[PDB]
Amino acid sequence: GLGTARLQLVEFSAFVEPRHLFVHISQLESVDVRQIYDKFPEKKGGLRELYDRGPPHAFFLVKFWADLNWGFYGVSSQYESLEHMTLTCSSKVCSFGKQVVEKVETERAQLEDGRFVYRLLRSPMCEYLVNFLHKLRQLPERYMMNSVLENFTILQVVTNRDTQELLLCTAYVFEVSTSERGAQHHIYRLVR
Ligand SMILES: *C(=O)CCCCCCCCCCCCC
């Protein structure tokens, strides 16, 4: 699903433990990237610009329906490949199309069961998102949460640190689910 030949997403969770999962991916239709240009900044590290350089098959959209019905605030990601690499993982939190956060992390391949795994586990969620989540769950209606969440996106860029080649670029968009329904995601390919 979320993956190329060179690098696949295996698991992605954001959570709080006193464990509640806001979102969870465990491991496609297309969407015109042009639809979502305005959801990200048009500066350097703009989605149009990234997509221009390519390659196009490295670009995905995840739509998350998140569970805000629930501490340590964490993000855990696991990628895997057959090639030994060092990864630069860049997360950009955007609000009204402006970047308000950039988190840049590095992970070296670890050999395990005949493949390379990259484990970025329990990275502490930045305080902007923690304060944001705390406010967001105070809202008395989901329709209000979704309205606020219309203006909030995440762009994750994963590159080969040694070659600077883009391996993965994922745009995240958000709504809230009911706790009855639980978290859900839909992964799409971005095309142009
Ligand atoms: C460091 O804080 C950056 C983290 C980047 C990924 C965070 C994505 C998960 C956030 C969950 C939010 C749920 C509702 C908006």
Kind of pairing between the strands at 98-108 and 20-26: unpaired
Label the pairing between strands 184-191 and 59-66: antiparallel
99: how many CB neighbours lie within 10 A of its CB?
16
User: Using a 6 Å cutoff on CB, does residue 168 contact ligand 1?
Assistant: no
Nearest alpha carbon to residue 132 among 63, 39, 38, 68 = 68
Q: Decide whether any atom of ligand 1 lies within 6 Å of the 103 Cβ.
A: yes
Q: Scanning the structure block, which residue is given the tokens 């995240």?
A: 172
Rounded to whole angstroms, how far apart are CA atoms 20 and 12? Answer: 13
C-alpha distances in angstroms, 182 versus 23, 68, 70, 76, 94? Answer: 9, 10, 11, 19, 25
Give the nearest ligand 1 atom to 172 CA: 8
Distance 109 CA to ligand 1 centre (A): 23
Q: Is 78 in the pocket of ligand 1 (CB under 6 A)?
A: no
Pairing mode of beta strands 184-191, 30-32: parallel
Distance 49 CA to ligand 1 centre (A): 23
Would residue 97 be called left, alpha or beta, if left means φ above 0 and alpha means ψ between -120 and 50 degrees? left
Which residue's CA is the closest to the ligand 1 atom numbered 14? 66
Peptide linkage before 55 cis (omega within 30 of 0): yes
Angstrom CA distances, 70 to 20, 85, 174, stand at 7, 37, 17
Q: Which residues pair with 64 in a beta bridge?
A: 174, 185
